[PDB]
Nucleic acid binder design. Structure first.
Ligand SMILES: [K+]
Ligand SMILES: [K+]
Ligand SMILES: [K+]
Ligand SMILES: [K+]
Ligand SMILES: [K+]
Ligand SMILES: [K+]
Ligand SMILES: [K+]
Ligand SMILES: [K+]
Ligand SMILES: [K+]
Ligand SMILES: [K+]
Ligand SMILES: [K+]
Ligand SMILES: [K+]
Ligand SMILES: [K+]
Ligand SMILES: [K+]
Ligand SMILES: [K+]
Ligand SMILES: [K+]
Ligand SMILES: [K+]
Ligand SMILES: [K+]
Ligand SMILES: [K+]
Ligand SMILES: [K+]
Ligand SMILES: [K+]
Ligand SMILES: [K+]
Ligand SMILES: [K+]
Ligand SMILES: [K+]
Ligand SMILES: [K+]
Ligand SMILES: [K+]
Ligand SMILES: [K+]
Ligand SMILES: [K+]
Ligand SMILES: [K+]
Ligand SMILES: [K+]
Ligand SMILES: [K+]
Ligand SMILES: [K+]
Ligand SMILES: [K+]
Ligand SMILES: [K+]
Ligand SMILES: [K+]
Ligand SMILES: [K+]
Ligand SMILES: [K+]
Ligand SMILES: [K+]
Ligand SMILES: [K+]
Ligand SMILES: [K+]
Ligand SMILES: [K+]
Ligand SMILES: [K+]
Ligand SMILES: [K+]
Ligand SMILES: [K+]
Ligand SMILES: [K+]
Ligand SMILES: [K+]
Ligand SMILES: [K+]
Ligand SMILES: [K+]
Ligand SMILES: [K+]
Ligand SMILES: [K+]
Ligand SMILES: [K+]
Ligand SMILES: [Mg+2]
Ligand SMILES: [Mg+2]
Ligand SMILES: [Mg+2]
Ligand SMILES: [Mg+2]
Ligand SMILES: [Mg+2]
Ligand SMILES: [Mg+2]
Ligand SMILES: [Mg+2]
Ligand SMILES: [Mg+2]
Ligand SMILES: [Mg+2]
Ligand SMILES: [Mg+2]
Ligand SMILES: [Mg+2]
Ligand SMILES: [Mg+2]
Ligand SMILES: [Mg+2]
Ligand SMILES: [Mg+2]
Ligand SMILES: [Mg+2]
Ligand SMILES: [Mg+2]
Ligand SMILES: [Mg+2]
Ligand SMILES: [Mg+2]
Ligand SMILES: [Mg+2]
Ligand SMILES: [Mg+2]
Ligand SMILES: [Mg+2]
Ligand SMILES: [Mg+2]
Ligand SMILES: [Mg+2]
Ligand SMILES: [Mg+2]
Ligand SMILES: [Mg+2]
Ligand SMILES: [Mg+2]
Ligand SMILES: [Mg+2]
Length: 245
RNA sequence: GGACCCGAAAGAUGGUGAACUAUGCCUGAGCGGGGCGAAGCCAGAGGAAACUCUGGUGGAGGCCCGCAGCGAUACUGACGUGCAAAUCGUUCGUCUGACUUGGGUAUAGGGGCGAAAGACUAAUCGAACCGUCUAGUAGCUGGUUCCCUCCGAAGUUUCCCUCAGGAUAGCUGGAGCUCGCGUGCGAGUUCUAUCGGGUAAAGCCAAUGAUUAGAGGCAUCGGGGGCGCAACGCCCUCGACCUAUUCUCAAACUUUAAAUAGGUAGGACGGUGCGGCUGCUUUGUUGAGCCGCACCACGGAAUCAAGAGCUCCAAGUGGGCCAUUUUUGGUAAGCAGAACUGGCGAUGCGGGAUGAACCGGAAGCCGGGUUACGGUGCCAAACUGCGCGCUAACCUAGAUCCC
RNA sequence: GAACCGGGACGUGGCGGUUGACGGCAACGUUAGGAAGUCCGGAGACGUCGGCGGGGGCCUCGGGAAGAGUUAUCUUUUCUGUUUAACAGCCUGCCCACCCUGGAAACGACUCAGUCGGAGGUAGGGUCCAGCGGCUGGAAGAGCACCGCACGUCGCGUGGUGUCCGGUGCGCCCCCGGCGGCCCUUGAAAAUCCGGAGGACCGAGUGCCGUCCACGCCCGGUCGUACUCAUAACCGCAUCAGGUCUCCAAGGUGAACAGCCUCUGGUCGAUGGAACAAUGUAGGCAAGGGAAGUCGGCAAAAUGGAUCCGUAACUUCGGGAAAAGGAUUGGCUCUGAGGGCUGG
RNA sequence: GCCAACUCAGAACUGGUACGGACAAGGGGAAUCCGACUGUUUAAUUAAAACAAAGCAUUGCGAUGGUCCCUGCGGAUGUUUACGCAAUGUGAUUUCUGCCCAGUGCUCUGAAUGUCAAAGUGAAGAAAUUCAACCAAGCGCGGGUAAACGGCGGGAGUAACUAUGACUCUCUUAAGGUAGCCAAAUGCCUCGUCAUCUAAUUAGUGACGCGCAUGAAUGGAUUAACGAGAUUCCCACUGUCCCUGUCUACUAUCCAGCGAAACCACAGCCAAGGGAACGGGCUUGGCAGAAUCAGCGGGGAAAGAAGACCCUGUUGAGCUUGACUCUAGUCCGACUUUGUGAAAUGACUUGAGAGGGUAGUAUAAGUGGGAGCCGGCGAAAGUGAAAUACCACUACUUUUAACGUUAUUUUACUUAUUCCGUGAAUCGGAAGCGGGGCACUGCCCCUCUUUUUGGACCCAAGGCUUGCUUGCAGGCCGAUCCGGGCGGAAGACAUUGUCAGGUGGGGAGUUUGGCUGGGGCGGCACAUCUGUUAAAAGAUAACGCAGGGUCCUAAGAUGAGCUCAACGAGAACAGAAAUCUCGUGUGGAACAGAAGGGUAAAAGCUCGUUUGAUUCUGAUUUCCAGUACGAAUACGAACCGUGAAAGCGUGGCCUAACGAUCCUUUAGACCUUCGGAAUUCGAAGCUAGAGGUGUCAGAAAAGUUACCACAGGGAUAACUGGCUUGUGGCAGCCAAGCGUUCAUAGCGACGUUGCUUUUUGAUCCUUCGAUGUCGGCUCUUCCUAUCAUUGUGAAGCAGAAUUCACCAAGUGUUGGAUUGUUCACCCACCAAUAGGGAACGUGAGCUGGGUUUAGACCGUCGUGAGACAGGUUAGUUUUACCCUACUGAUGACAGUGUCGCAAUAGUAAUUCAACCUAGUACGAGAGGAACCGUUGAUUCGCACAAUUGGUCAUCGCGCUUGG
């Protein structure tokens, strides 16, 4: 008869993201004439740590195309980039790690990261540490390109979408065991209030479908409907299968 | 309808709280002295080499002892109308981190928040607090205020999600009305004459069923012994079978069959003789009812009759209990359940020492007389009265229906 | 009394015109020493733990002088105080950082630990940075201590002497510097201030144009401000043994803001008196036995610091471990070892 | 030479061996269980094994998305992007994680139309409307999934002693418990069996295992280190105890001052009686003497609370689901937003064409004339149910366009709509400057200037041209022209709105009968019949006794004929039993069913004819209120059956076999009404049936609560007490037998009479505005049905020992292991280790181990919430100062004091050992007493401190730490 924890997540106010010390969103430059037709040079000024994010971020300074001022940007750092390196963004940029190129100019089999979904969205795919996308094939007829996402899914995107050559830096982070609850506490302290987690069978019936009973047990199949209403949809949602491979 | 008065656990609606506590966020603050000695580094020794070893340096850890801080294991100590609606004493866990803490800020009631105890959300939480709907509804508990006088019950029938309730009939009060005065439309009573019954008893030597024992006979058709190869050959034993007897039996057996109790009748609403009506009935004014006329009818058994009949409105009651006799279940019960009557309940009074039911007896306030049951050695009113026997208790002799 | 900040307006003097200073090889220095739209950097500005070093305050030892305490005996001894603010100038120059010469293996330099060097060490000479460092002005005229004269009811009167010279440190509080460890944790923003890139534009010859220089002048609103901050000034119905954030922090013992005693400061506030029955509450002891008591060793007792020797099974090799088990510990008189500065 | 600090290590000497001298400050060891560890938790009874945790595993999701909030609009995750976010399970490491997809879930690019709404389409009708086809999701079917919920049994045969079953086959229901582990925190029996630990062990450990009911991420097994966690043992230690004593402070105490509260019908001495079955009051007795002090915990069924256990109520509430009725969300279809075009594919139209046999070649598929049709067929017959010849139309399978309908797809446009980006900064077309090919002067193909470096980059130089002569100012190029789309993506799809179907414990509301020797479980005594209890009219109870929702066109109606069961005697197979003949035959047969009645030219059996099992309403009986329903009976008014007729027949031979209102549905009338008037549909009325309520005078209805609540109930359970005594316990009577013979020394079968209330039952009288619910500890008293001790009788009593019985309750009846234990069982001593009551004595006397709140784990059960006469661990014990009782203390008792008497009440002593008797009596031996006397001892009681021991704040003396 009580709202369950998963339901209470949506309202927020204690489950909102912790973003006080973050350095701002990481994204490409806004797509403009120079990047659409030629190339624009930038210089990496700093590689910084973004709290709550495994991948490091790189500060890049560009010369504004038509204003007398500096154009400052914050890119997701690709492995191998360094302070003082020159970064080239555009259709005519060379195929080197760190450069941002339109997918039409990236040959098949290349390794890219922070791939745009819509032309000009400034990067949504393959952004986490150690992740990358692979260019599969190009379709000149309809101006679309096929890529392989980190999850293994194959997606078709317009060939005008941009991507950064190389893989995201910071790879191999998750292979290290934490060994203790304190490390997880520190990890999630900067992400959101999602830890520790209480098992549903440890609760009373009033606050979870798994609650209750003189023994700890679910008492009914943990696989639930895709259309099950909130508060009832707990456990393995719309599972096509369960158990080991 | 507030509906005689007071009372629920709940439900609904609209608002108020995160000054406590829970969790997230922002910004500050706080945490002796010791123990163990991880990486990294310096030097030396052994060895053919590989490599091994030794002595130092250094100071890692959700590491250890432990102060402050934070918390609260045991005494199941103290206190337990306390210093205190959670405190006090000793003891105890942790103490550089998932650490402790101030202020700001966010989350508000079927909502929040929860390292999860249904925990916490201002001493309030398995749904807060405040006002209102609201005099919420209760077949349930408790109360329900002057006097005398008269009458005066019921715990039983049927129906009801009915079994602590209600309606219904019965029992009761009030109001009367119609008549009547012994010629009485009457009666919890007898008498006379007539009917029905299957209980008590009795019966099996009567049907059905149950059951003991012998006696006398019988078989080409029972089990055995003897005489026999067998024999529808012979002699006996036990069994069946038949006959006449015999012990003992029945709520769901019975020919017979009481006591008690049940029904009907004993005139004025009768009888007799004529005449009439009918569409009913008959072969038939043959019957069946009914209707007029005429005559007779001493009231047609006893006793009693503080009289008989009729109607309206309505209260309370619908838990009963006890006793002689009849009687079911049960070893039995101050158990449980039925029949008739009476009693207690609703009722005092004398007796049974004492007691709701036993015995007596029922009652306005008094004087006198006499009794009922029960008593007359004292307690304690009335004889140590007049008589006959029995008992002697070295077990507390024995001493009055229910008891 | 002596300073500082912000704002406003001018005057005098100074500074520049090679229109927009000079010096240094350099790091950079000097009180001044152009400039508008536009643009750029820095400060503000940041976690936690460990070692080391510097500064201020405190603690501590000795000598000089002033007063006081003890003095049956000893005590050149015991106690108290012996001070220097903001601000201005000059000097100095920690640990780093930076500059010039030069070119290094027989490698050297170097920290407690590290670390550094042909991307230029060691060495020699310099620049800069901190300071809660030094001297002077402030400022001895003040404050404090001591010794005197005077009114002796009301002179907040009047005068003198001193305030000096050294040591010491794993000492304590605060601040700072520079390294190192930790993170799947990397530990605010803005107001405001400073600096820089550029150079449109701008002036004269005995006066003009500028000037962040020195001195001089004027002004600076509104509200809070007593007191308690707790075993009686807040909450707990109270003058309630509860609860309520934080700053300062002496001596001795001792590892120690442990316990115990003491100095400054505070305080004897818990209604008082007599007696010392039982039963209680809190705190001890008890011959012999040693858990037989009890559901149960509940409670209590036993052990305990430091130094030396020694330490099993098992083990995830990290531990177990202070395993277990043994010895010592006072006082007094000595001995040995472990350092700094100066001088060829 | 001048200064400087406290650390370390040694050596003498020395004290009453004191010396971390106070303070400060681990007890240790050998194992089992759980949890890895650190961390967290029920503020105010549970700190734990519970929660969390790292590690392991599973599930969803690529933004037009997953999960979630929101009335709506819009939001959180998201300053995010799979090394991520979201939803679950297990719980370090090590090792392993077996079989099952049938069930419930979840899931799928699967077959298919079995079912499937609204809208839309077609037919008929005057229309309302009704019929058809088409028809989304979902459901059904199929497939997959167990680190999803969960499950892992039984049977038959089989090895050469037996036993088992390597092996083979089978059933439910998919499989049949694998690796492991165990009387476990999990095992009933159970205190299981063996070993070990002890003197003794329901405890601990190890081992065994058809294990009521162990078992593999509902995780199995182990595990170093850790733990205010549960357990066993050992050393040290002790006032826990034997067994108490003593000391210090504060109280209590007494005084001055000050000064409440709880509680209170009236009150307060007892024994018994009866009584509401436990009185302070009543009855009968015992008794009983002012006024006061300090304690005390027997009683006041003491106080504290309208019992929380249990039951009842037509009272809730938290939670669950396979309960009833709904609902947010979600999926799906239609219409709307919604505009502009082009093609395929499947049906529906018509229109031409091809094909076929259960036995035969064959359309003989179906139809008519065929005797005649256009050399060809019948005209003959082979199959034959039915003819080929010439005509079509009828059914089924099968191709394609002229017209038209319908449905599903593919695709085109952009301005509606939706989404993305930007400080809406170069978008579309063309042309110029440059580079390249060709061949010859044009065509074609390309580019917009920036890539060794951690620099800077803006506000135009220059040329041409005007005002007039420039303080300077105005134009073009530099900087191509033209496009009145900021740049893209999807796009009439999505989205919004309204209806329609599905899903929907996420959420709302509600329900979850009654009777009942408490309630539950069980049963139905709830409608209802027979016999009996039932007491000879009727009526009559119990969860008394023994039993009993249909069936029949005949098993109803009527007429006629006949007589049944059984037995006796006869007839081939044939007999106990087949069929047939005669005789007897009161029903001993049959009549649907339970039982009881009833019936013989019938009520039974056979046959003939039939539908009175018909129509109309009234009356009566049974039930009973003299209501209804059911059932039945007697007339009346009709139409019939049967019989010759009387007559009989209104269902079954009689006594049971069944059903209101509202609604629906059927039958009947030339019936009534639709209210402005007519006709026709439709609807509504009147009379009679049918669909049913079995809780049967008739709601529409699942659980759980140990998180719990309220109104009440002693109308009703869980103690004591009261009745009873079946059961338990303890006695007697008779005498068949036992006892070498002998019923009775000692016993007592078959029978039979009693007593007791320390057993357990039976009951429900008292107590539910509360009488504190096990056991132990302490303390007193009482009983005898006597264990020991004193005195006796008897014996199958030689002695010793033993047994039976009689007076007898004066005295005593113990220390320990296991268990919470009562109980039990062992060890040990002893004279003995008897049995019992006192509210199953005794919690304001203690304790709290167990039962019996809230936390948590296991097993079994349940889908679940949860349950559990199963196990386990942690879990607040309140108040006396009132009255009485009791213990002591003043006082009163007629001046004061001393010495005394004395009723009455209380009472106290107990048992054993040794020596001698005595190696005696007795006895064949073996063995083996006792009296007297002497000396000690046990338990208990009353005192006392010479000695020993204990006690210190003599604060008495000494020593000593820190200041
Ligand atoms: K809710
Ligand atoms: K959290
Ligand atoms: K968890
Ligand atoms: K559950
Ligand atoms: K589980
Ligand atoms: K009324
Ligand atoms: K607060
Ligand atoms: K904070
Ligand atoms: K609420
Ligand atoms: K009632
Ligand atoms: K008879
Ligand atoms: K008979
Ligand atoms: K009534
Ligand atoms: K800050
Ligand atoms: K650091
Ligand atoms: K200052
Ligand atoms: K400048
Ligand atoms: K002030
Ligand atoms: K204050
Ligand atoms: K013990
Ligand atoms: K025990
Ligand atoms: K810890
Ligand atoms: K822990
Ligand atoms: K704990
Ligand atoms: K856990
Ligand atoms: K989303
Ligand atoms: K799972
Ligand atoms: K399955
Ligand atoms: K399945
Ligand atoms: K199966
Ligand atoms: K495991
Ligand atoms: K613990
Ligand atoms: K007083
Ligand atoms: K008496
Ligand atoms: K009720
Ligand atoms: K509740
Ligand atoms: K649409
Ligand atoms: K729906
Ligand atoms: K639901
Ligand atoms: K009939
Ligand atoms: K009913
Ligand atoms: K319920
Ligand atoms: K008995
Ligand atoms: K009772
Ligand atoms: K009660
Ligand atoms: K005991
Ligand atoms: K505890
Ligand atoms: K005298
Ligand atoms: K005496
Ligand atoms: K003495
Ligand atoms: K003494
Ligand atoms: Mg579990
Ligand atoms: Mg707060
Ligand atoms: Mg500790
Ligand atoms: Mg009778
Ligand atoms: Mg009488
Ligand atoms: Mg009289
Ligand atoms: Mg550290
Ligand atoms: Mg010092
Ligand atoms: Mg002076
Ligand atoms: Mg400049
Ligand atoms: Mg207040
Ligand atoms: Mg020291
Ligand atoms: Mg919305
Ligand atoms: Mg479908
Ligand atoms: Mg097995
Ligand atoms: Mg285990
Ligand atoms: Mg009595
Ligand atoms: Mg009550
Ligand atoms: Mg109550
Ligand atoms: Mg009722
Ligand atoms: Mg006949
Ligand atoms: Mg009907
Ligand atoms: Mg004899
Ligand atoms: Mg006796
Ligand atoms: Mg006795
Ligand atoms: Mg289960
Ligand atoms: Mg006496």
């Amino acid at each position: 008869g009580r709202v369950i924890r998963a339901q209470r997540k949506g309202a927020g106010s204690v489950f909102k993201s912790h973003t006080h010390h973050r350095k701002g969103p990481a994204k490409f430059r806004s797509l403009d004439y120079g990047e659409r037709n030629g190339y624009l040079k930038g210089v990496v000024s700093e590689i910084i740590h973004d709290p709550g994010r495994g991948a490091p971020l790189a500060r890049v300074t560009f010369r504004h195309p038509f204003r007398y001022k500096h154009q400052k940007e914050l890119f997701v750092a690709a492995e191998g980039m360094y302070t003082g390196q020159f970064i080239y963004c555009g259709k005519k940029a060379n195929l080197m790690v760190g450069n941002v190129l339109a997918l039409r100019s990236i040959p098949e089999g290349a390794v890219v990261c922070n791939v745009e979904h819509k032309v000009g969205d400034r990067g949504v795919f393959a952004r986490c540490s150690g992740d990358y996308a692979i260019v599969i094939s190009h379709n000149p007829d309809n101006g679309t390109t096929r890529i392989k996402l980190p999850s293994g899914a194959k997606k078709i995107v317009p060939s005008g979408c941009r991507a950064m050559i190389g893989q995201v830096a910071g790879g191999g982070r998750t292979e290290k065991p934490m060994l203790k609850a304190g490390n997880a506490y520190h990890k999630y302290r900067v992400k959101r209030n999602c830890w520790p987690k209480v098992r549903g069978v440890a609760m009373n019936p009033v606050e979870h479908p798994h609650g209750g009973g003189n023994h700890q047990h679910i008492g009914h199949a943990s696989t639930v409907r895709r259309d099950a209403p909130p508060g009832q949809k707990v456990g393995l949602i719309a599972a096509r299968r369960t158990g080991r491979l």
